């Protein structure tokens, strides 16, 4: 079964780590920092891993049922799964499928819904994955609402994410990091069957982001997102399941109206695109334009400068 | 998108002359490829620069380009007779579309 | 040697219909796409449409002034491309070139011309 990667172009795919819409390709050094994302890996022959899952909507959501800490606005929720089934805390991941794998303050809406007479309910809910109260690996993550009295318990209740907060305007742009992963299990408590980092081994070579601009809700956030592999080929890797004859898939950025190729690429098996490129540069790419696979090459196949 | 030319640009021989190629708000990102290809009486057009700056083999380094957004520009130095022809800029964006414009007469002065 | 010859195009009545060819020798027809551009009697060259190769998903794509009425294809078989012009209007009155869009060295291009 041969491999290959979708016919989607970048405005027509979905950013793996949050639900995004991609904007641009982003090449850059990721050597100050330890890219390890948990959303949105998977192998170029169908594996899943960390907390990447199919249904890219699912992404930094959270379902279960919320109590009221009392005297304040902020409410915990009892985490369970997609499915409203019981979440099994002892299942071999870092958290529940669809956790944000970021530190930052994630602004959206919990909405409820009253399982007997149909009643609703919504209220605009932050929720930082950077606290203290923040585990979702052990099942309860804490939101800060806007009300304090209209929260049922032991009912069904969902966080819709929108954007990301920056807290008091103070120092511009350093939250949310997108790069910092979260502590799944609270304080003290390390993460657990995290996904690898990734890293460029070759000389000259970076890592080509899938970068998207996450909503601002208040404040001055960072609101860049680059994922290593769009959720689309996250879904078409596991459809295909194709196995890998290398280390090594070259991919060709192909202009459909033209036919001539930009630039090559490596996909990596294990899940990341890297480049031959020095810098911070944002690639000038055809609206229209996709990856195509080519073949499997050398494990150190020099590229061409980008 | 409406590509605006001049009409005509004259020169003496020796002279440097510039064409412009200007669009309009139409500015879908920064994947604005500019072409510019030259057309004697009787003949058919010829390539003399693509991708903005670029040159195909066999053209003179008398011709250069710029691009500037919407607003491209073809650069004709040390004119001499057989460039009096008509210049003619392209633009595509990658969607599938190519525009061209209303076409240039140089004229060699003199 | 790239070379194209288009041919079939005359006299038709406006509201009528008319189809012209372009033949290609020297390359691979179904490795290029090609591209119909028109200039009217005195005025500059007008962009009608072109075809993509048919690895890439076929596809057509057309100018504002002529969608809805003038359709592109191409026989790879035959070395053809087809410009078939459908419900014909007076401003259509032109000199029409089939060129390939090249794929070497550049993107836009247009590297060689029909006479």
């Known amino acids: 079964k041969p491999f290959s990667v979708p016919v989607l172009t970048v405005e027509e795919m979905t950013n793996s780590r949050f639900p995004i819409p991609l904007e641009k390709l982003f090449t850059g050094p990721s050597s100050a920092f330890v890219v390890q994302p948990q959303n949105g890996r998977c192998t170029t022959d169908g594996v899943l891993l960390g907390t990447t899952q199919l249904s890219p909507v699912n992404i930094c959501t959270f379902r279960g049922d919320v109590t009221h800490i009392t005297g304040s606005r902020n409410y915990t929720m009892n985490l369970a799964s997609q499915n409203w089934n019981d979440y099994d805390p002892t299942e071999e991941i870092p958290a529940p499928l669809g956790t944000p794998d970021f530190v930052g303050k994630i602004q959206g809406v919990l909405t409820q819904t009253t399982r007997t007479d149909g009643s609703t309910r919504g209220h605009k809910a932050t929720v930082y994955t950077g606290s203290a109260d923040f585990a979702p690996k052990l099942g309860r993550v804490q939101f800060e609402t806007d009300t304090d009295r209209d929260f049922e318990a032991n009912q069904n209740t969902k966080f819709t994410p929108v954007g990301v907060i920056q807290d008091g305007g103070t120092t511009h742009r350093n939250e949310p990091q997108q790069w910092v992963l979260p502590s799944y299990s609270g304080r003290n408590t390390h993460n657990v069957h995290l996904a690898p980092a990734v890293a460029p081994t070759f000389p000259g070579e970076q890592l080509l982001f899938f970068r998207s601009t996450m909503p601002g809700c208040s404040g001055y956030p960072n609101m860049d997102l680059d994922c290593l592999l769009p959720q689309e080929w996250v879904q078409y890797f596991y459809q295909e399941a194709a196995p890998a004859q290398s280390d090594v898939a070259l991919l060709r950025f192909v202009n459909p109206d033209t036919g001539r190729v930009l630039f090559e690429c490596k996909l990596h098996k294990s899940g990341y695109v890297t480049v031959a490129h020095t810098g911070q540069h944002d690639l000038v790419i055809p609206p229209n334009g996709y990856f195509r696979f080519d073949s499997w090459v050398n494990q150190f196949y020099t590229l061409a400068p980008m | 998108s409406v590509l605006i030319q001049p009409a005509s640009v004259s020169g003496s021989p020796g002279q440097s002359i510039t064409i412009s190629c200007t669009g309009t708000?139409?500015?879908?990102?920064?994947?604005?490829?500019f072409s510019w290809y030259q057309q004697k009486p009787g003949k058919v057009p010829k390539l003399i620069i693509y991708?903005?700056?670029k040159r195909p083999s066999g053209v003179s380094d008398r011709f250069s380009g710029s691009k500037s957004g919407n607003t491209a520009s073809l650069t004709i130095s040390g004119l001499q007779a057989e460039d009096e022809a008509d210049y003619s800029c392209?633009?595509?964006?990658?969607?599938?579309?190519?525009?061209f414009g209303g076409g240039t007469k140089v004229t060699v002065l003199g | 040697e790239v070379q194209l010859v288009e041919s079939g195009g005359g006299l038709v009545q406006p509201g009528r219909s008319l189809r012209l060819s372009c033949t290609v020798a020297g390359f691979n027809f179904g490795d290029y796409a090609m591209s119909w551009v028109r200039q009217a009697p005195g005025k500059g060259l007008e962009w009608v449409g072109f075809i993509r190769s048919n690895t890439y998903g076929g596809a057509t794509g057309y100018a504002a002034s002529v969608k809805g009425r003038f359709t592109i294809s191409r026989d790879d078989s035959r070395n053809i491309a087809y410009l078939q012009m459908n419900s014909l209007k007076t401003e259509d009155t032109a000199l029409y070139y089939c060129?390939?869009?090249?794929?070497?060295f550049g993107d836009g291009l247009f590297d060689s011309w029909g006479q």
């Open positions: 991708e903005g700056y």
């Open positions: 060129s390939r869009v090249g794929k070497d």
């Open positions: 708000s139409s500015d879908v990102g920064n994947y604005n490829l």
């Open positions: 392209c633009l595509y964006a990658g969607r599938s579309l190519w525009v």
